[model samples]
Structure formats: structure tokens, C-alpha cells
Target: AVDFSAHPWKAPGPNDSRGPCPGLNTLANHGFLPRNGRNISVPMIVKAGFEGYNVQSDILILAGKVGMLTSREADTISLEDLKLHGTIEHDASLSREDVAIGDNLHFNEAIFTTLANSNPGADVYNISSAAQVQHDRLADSVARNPNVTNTDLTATIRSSESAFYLTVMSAGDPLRGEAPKKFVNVFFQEERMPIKEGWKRSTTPINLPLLGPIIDRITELSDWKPTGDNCGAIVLGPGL
Candidate 1:
């Protein structure tokens, strides 16, 4: 639990995971973020979960417990010696945790991970069908605005040349106590149509005028949120 000296807006460290959303921090340092009185802050996943309550963020997890596994908790087992048949050698040290009930073996309980390069967890948001919808919306947007057309759709719709976003993504099991799974990711078209600027960086503000509205359409496509009852979701910072 966090005991805030001043609460919530403290600098990054213990109890502070809001640090700097990479791109937002960069933009602010160079004086690009809005200077209007609005002062919108980036939404962030805290490092250590917060102490008992706030309205929107903490109240949701007010009654949650961290999921964990221990030696005496779940049933424990061992891998069958594969020297004669099993294939891969089992780590003798892991035997105390990994269990074999019948012919089937189970790995120890699932754990939340922050490793970005590790295997990604299963999709909790069901965003697999989102691309088609995005295409439909883009076509509509193109038709509605004469300023943008098929010729520059890639620059206007795909990159920051059009607009920026503040999207939140999560990866973990939806049901409590289930083994972690990987989520499905939508890759834009490949093989059929590829843009050379597909990976280039963008310079558009989140509310830029000309292409902002269209860009905003591509933002926040999913509606996933954190529960904290099980393993909490690892999130990508602001820009991905």
C-alpha cells in the first residue's frame, strides 16, 4: 500500500509508475504539449498498486487481492524422466513446483510479467476484428473530407502525419485463476499493400486540425480495463 507524503502526483519511484510516458515526456520537454489551461495528463499504470482508494482508478480494485502460488497451495508434481522418452530434460529444481497429476503435466501457476520482449499474453480486448472497422471508417472519412484522398491515405491515416493517440492496451487472462494466454494482434495489410512509411514516426498533435479527427478514429479501438483480482495487465506506454 502507498502512503503518500502528498499523494498521487509524486515523482517516479516507489508507488509512482506514472513517470513519463516516453513520447509525452519528450514532447513536453520540447514544449509541444498543449499549454492551454486544459493540461491533460497521460493515463498510466502505477508501479506498485495504490493504497485504499480514489474515485475512478482505485475504487475498482478496492476489494482485490494479488493472485499467487505457493508450495503448499496448489497440487505439486514432477516431469517424467525423458532420457528414455520424454524428449526435453526437466529441471530437477522445478520439480517441487511443476506438477504431474495424471499423464498430463502442469506448469506452476501464472505470474504477471513486465518483460516487453517476452512472449505476449493473450488478447483480452478482442481487437482482432478492429482493422476491418478501421478500414470502413477510413473510407468514410476519406469520402467525407475532400482534403484527404486515396493518394495520401497512408500518410494521413496510418502515421502521425495525421494525428496522435492516447490508447491503453492490456495482455492477460480475463477469467480469474486461469493460466495466462496470448492476445491476438491485428497487423495492417501485408503482401497486398505495404507503405514505405509504415514504420516512420509522426509529428501530429493529438488534436491537430486537418487530420486530427480522422486520426482520433484510429485511437482507443479497444475497451479493456484493469481488474487487479488476478495478474494485472502490463501496459504499453503512451505512443507504443
Candidate 2:
């Protein structure tokens, strides 16, 4: 529980575990680990019937309690381990607390990770085919645009330019859990093709017909309910 003062929030002592509030984390493991946030899953395994595990992020567990695993618990048993469990334990009556019994050995146990940068990640996101995105045929945005014309198609096929995006990210360290963020600005200038047509090339002082309309529209909208900032701008849509 948390008690809010006029201007600040307050909690008791250096060891407070009981909590139902947001924006706070619980520490465990002899003050070695700090657990925070919801849906934060840890990886674990059972060694000689003792359950221990590691998490993707640092976590604080008091240790010694095998069943104190997680709420969203599931098991990934190796084929060999599957046979050893004598089939999955689907019935709750089979366990001591009527909690689901995961016989898959890997079902609910993990060995605590004792080192950082110990193992490298396996693969990248783009090349992964195991994704479960909605399998649908989305219309090709530019190709199907009603505004598109033969000129647009020809220009697009030959046009080559880089686009840049600005992003904001934030992170919270586990030792003091608050948020997770990693802000990076990525510019796609690699192996780029060159401009092959008129109207396909970017103009200097891009603030021109390019940026003017966009800025106008933004300015108009901001007048309605403003969010002020000054940056490199675009001009589009009759200023509003």
C-alpha cells in the first residue's frame, strides 16, 4: 500500500513487499534483485527437483518457493523431458495446491541467471517467419491510392530516396524499476538508389511547397487545440 502526501509519494522502510499500487517495484533475493511491473516473465528450470530460474530482465524473488512462479505460467518441455513427465499435468488435483501441475519439467521451473551478457541473442525480427501477425492482404497503399496515376507508378518504380524518422524511448533499470525505453533515431541511407525522375528529387530548403502546406495545416489545427513545438516542417492540405 502507498500513502500519498501533498506533493510526494511515501512508502515504509527499505524492505516493503506488500503492495497493490502502481509505479513501484518489489525487491527480493537479499536485496540483489528488484521485481517490477506487470507481465514481466522470468525463465526458469528445475535442477534435481529444485526450481530456480532467470528472467529476461532482472527480477527479485525471495527464493525457495517453487510455486511462486508467475501468473501467466506455461511450460516449454523438450521432447525428451515430455516423455519423462508421463504426459502433461492438466489436472490441478495432481499438485499440492491444486494449482496447475506442469510436468513438462520446463513447464514452470528455471535456473537463476548469475551473469549478464552471458549468452547472445539468436536472431533478428525481420527475418523471423514465426510471427503471428494477422494474415491478410492489405491493399498496397501507393498502388491502390485513388490519387495515384500512371505518372505516380512510373515515378515510384524509378524513384530512390531515404526517409528518416524521429523517435522517443525511455528505460528503467531493474535495480530501480520505473520504465523501459531505448530511444534511437534510425536513418535508412544504406544501399540507396538515386533519383531517376523530376518531382522525385528533394529540393533544398525543403520548407518550400514541400513543407509549407504541412506547416499551415498543423498551425491551423494547433489553433484549435494547440501542442506547440518548432521543428523542420512540411506544408500540406491547405494549411488546415
Candidate 3:
């Protein structure tokens, strides 16, 4: 089990970097990763992900590798590096605005409010609730942003992110993909782990195989069809 006492939550300093990823931001806030949110290596992220949330090595490594491509350093990534649009960050985020709207790094309260209202009267956020919110956010973006991008890959990534929060915040069962609404809200709004609210790391590792079906379920529930040519100017290189 993770020693919550050792990793006390501290809000990020003015100079400390933060980005669109509340998962990584929460880890950084709790000192599970780097409190400074800088010079993060793949191994460090993998270790932190497992120790803090019981996320499997492969998933953490994959996210870290993609984040590294946006970094100035060869082997490490800063939280600010993740702010680069279209890499790991994409449009129609649950809490963040689209890149075309500018200031996509900071959390948007309006977007979060929409998410919070998606499943009114529900105590927990499950796969269906997540899918509904994600689909609504996408529609909002499409209506608001003239240059909103939503390619097949970005759509998949968006669904994975929704699955990620649900799995990580699940009451010790990632496969169930159900988390308390309050816990999920605290994670996004405060960027802190809800340990004080009785949240615990899953005993089961949240791996790709486990997450695949959850992602698929969210996708199915949302019934979103991706536009293959929505990449715009963002091109995937051989390394990325």
C-alpha cells in the first residue's frame, strides 16, 4: 500500500509546472512523482504511477514516452512539456478547453461544471456517466471552436483519458471503472489525491489489457464517430 503520510499534498508553486493532465498533476501535488513537476523520467513516472495509483508499467511508460517527445530534454519530461497541443493534450477535454481557444493548459471551471452536471443526482461516476460527459464536451467544442480537431487517434486518446480517471479513482477495483463523484471532482479541481476522503490505490494494477475494454465501453456508450482527417496541421512523426 502507498504511504499517504509521506506524500502529503502541496499545491504547485508559481514557477512549478502543471498541465492538462490531472492524473500527473495529482501525483505531482502528492509528491508521488516530482513536487516540482520537472525533469521527470520514464522510469520515475512508471514507478510513481504504480506506487501511487497501482497503474501498470506499460501504460505509464507509453504515456511517458509520448510526453518525452514534447520535452526539451532527451530522456525527461516536464509537466509544461505536456502543454504542447495535439501531443498528449487534445481537444474537448473534460476540464480543459481546446487548443484553438488558447490557454488550454489551465483547468476550465465551466467545462468542469458541465461534467459535474452530466450525471445529476448520481453519487458515483461510472462508465456510462463518463461517456455522456465526454460526448457532451465534444459537442460543445464542435459548436464553439471553429478549428476544433478530433481525429481517430485523438478520439481514442480522449476516451482513454476518461477511462483513466474512472479507473484510477475506482474504489479499489479498476475493472469496475466506477468512482465517487466527489473524489473525481477533487482530483480535477484541487489536483490532489482524495486519500483524506477514503480513496485508496487499487490492489490490481491498471494495465493496458484492463483499460482496453473500459475504453471500448466508454466509446460505445458515447457513440462518437471520429473524423479521420481532423489532424489539421498536427503531423505524427516516426518517433512520436
Candidate 4:
């Protein structure tokens, strides 16, 4: 269950600088926010469920149809030449506290797409990075297999570098909230992924398997729709 009291994003208040979550305003006032978020602060985005966050995902995967032993050669283009583009928009409140604490939202699927194409001495078959250390590991694993079931061979790639490492220097600040010292991967409820083959497209917005927990916490938060209040919220999901 989501701790609403601890999650300041879900807890609503005045959508202005007078609210408790002043971080968004502070960043905006200093011109540190993204271009999309330049007009307002974090509070405006989470005004009691008026608007939400969004994560746009784009990647290609080889989908193995049911009863098919594997995906055909016709499939397996890691970007599918830009055919595999989609977006997942979520809650704006989710990023409020974390973004203030130096935590950055990441689009793993997008990042991995670039990494996939950059491999050296690559094979002809498409390969998404994961579980193995060698090139063509993804392709080789699915091949020469007798089982009709879909298989995923992966070569996981990651970087320890923080997106926004602790560079803020406060002078004798004994009463400062604990902001993260490094960039943190804040995954949403249903993260997307890129697979060479043997994958499924979710029609109902299901979370991508092996990705991580799907954060439906906002569903549990107080519900309010934009009726008379024309104020729109800004949602930040995965970045390109």
C-alpha cells in the first residue's frame, strides 16, 4: 500500500508557492525546470488529481505469436524503424518529492534502445541487451531450441553514474531535508521494454514484465477531476 501521509505528492494543498512542497517552485523560479515545466511548479501539477504524469516509450520487439515456435526473420528490428512508439502517462505527484531529492525519472526501454544499436561487430538478427555477456546472446538463445514457448535472451547493461549527483552545497544547513546524493532510478508502475522477439503488446496498459513494480499509488490517492478548475498538471515520465 502507498503511504499517502509519507507521500507528499498525493497529499494535496494550495497549488502555489505557499504550499508545503516548495521545491518545484524553487526550481522553476531559478529556471532549472524542463522546458515543458517552465510555466509552473510541482504543486500545480498535482492539484488534487487534476493532471498526471506521462511516460512515452518507443522500442521494437519480436513478438512470438501463440503456437509459433519463434518469431520470424521479418520481425526483430530494434526500433522497428520507429514503428514501436508508445507512451505511458502516469501521476504527476509521484515525482514531486523524489525529483526534489535529486532523484531522476528514467526511461529504461528508450535508453536500452540506443545501447542496442551501438553494439560492436553485431549479428544480423536483432538483439536486445540483457542476461548474457556475449554479442548475439539474445538471438543464439532463442535459436536451436525445440520448445515452442517464447524465450527471451538478455544482456543487462547499466551505469552506476547518477543523473543528478549531490552537487548542492549548503552552508551549516542543519535543518535540511535529506535529498538523494546520487541519481536514482524511479520506475513507474508499468515500464516498457524492447525485445528482439517473443514479446507481447499490452492492450490494457499492463506493466511490462521483468521491468519492475507498477506504481498505481495515485489510484489510492484522493480522486478529483478537473471540472471548473481549468488548471492543468505537468507529468514527467521517461525522457528521450
* Best by the lDDT measure: 3
Instruction: Sort every candidate by TM-score, greatest first.
Output: 3, 1, 4, 2
**Candidate No. with top TM-score:** 3
Off by over 4 Å in 2: 1-210, 219-240
Backbone clash pairs for candidate 3 read none
lDDT of 1 by residue, 1-240 (tens): 333332222122232111112222222222232212122322221121112111123311211111111112232111111111111111111111111211112222221111112223432222222322334434433444343222232222233211211111112221111111121111101100011222111122112343234344433441222212332232211122
Q: Model 4: per-residue lDDT, tens digit, 144-197?
A: 323211111101111000001001111111112111211111111121111122
Report the C-alpha displacement of residue 240, candidate 1, in angstroms.
30
Tens digits of lDDT, candidate 3, 1-240: 567799999989999888789999999999988889998999999989888888989888887888887876778878887888777778889998888876789988988997787667878888898999888888988889988888777878888998998989887678888888888989899998898898888888899999999999998999898654765344332236
For residues 1-240, could you state the per-residue lDDT of candidate 2 as single tens digits?
111111121233434332211111111211112321222223322221111111211111221121122222342221121121111111111001111222312211121111111112521111011010000001121223333112221111111000000000112121211111111110011111111111111112121233233323322322222112322232211213
Worst 10 residues of 3 by lDDT: 230-239
lDDT of each candidate versus the true structure = 0.22, 0.18, 0.85, 0.20
Show where candidate 4 strays beyond 4 Å: 1-73, 80-181, 185-214, 222-240
Estimate TM-scores for all models: 0.21, 0.13, 0.94, 0.16
Model 4 worst lDDT run, 10 consecutive residues: 157-166
By TM-score, is 2 or 4 better? 4
Select the stronger candidate by TM-score from 1 and 2.
1
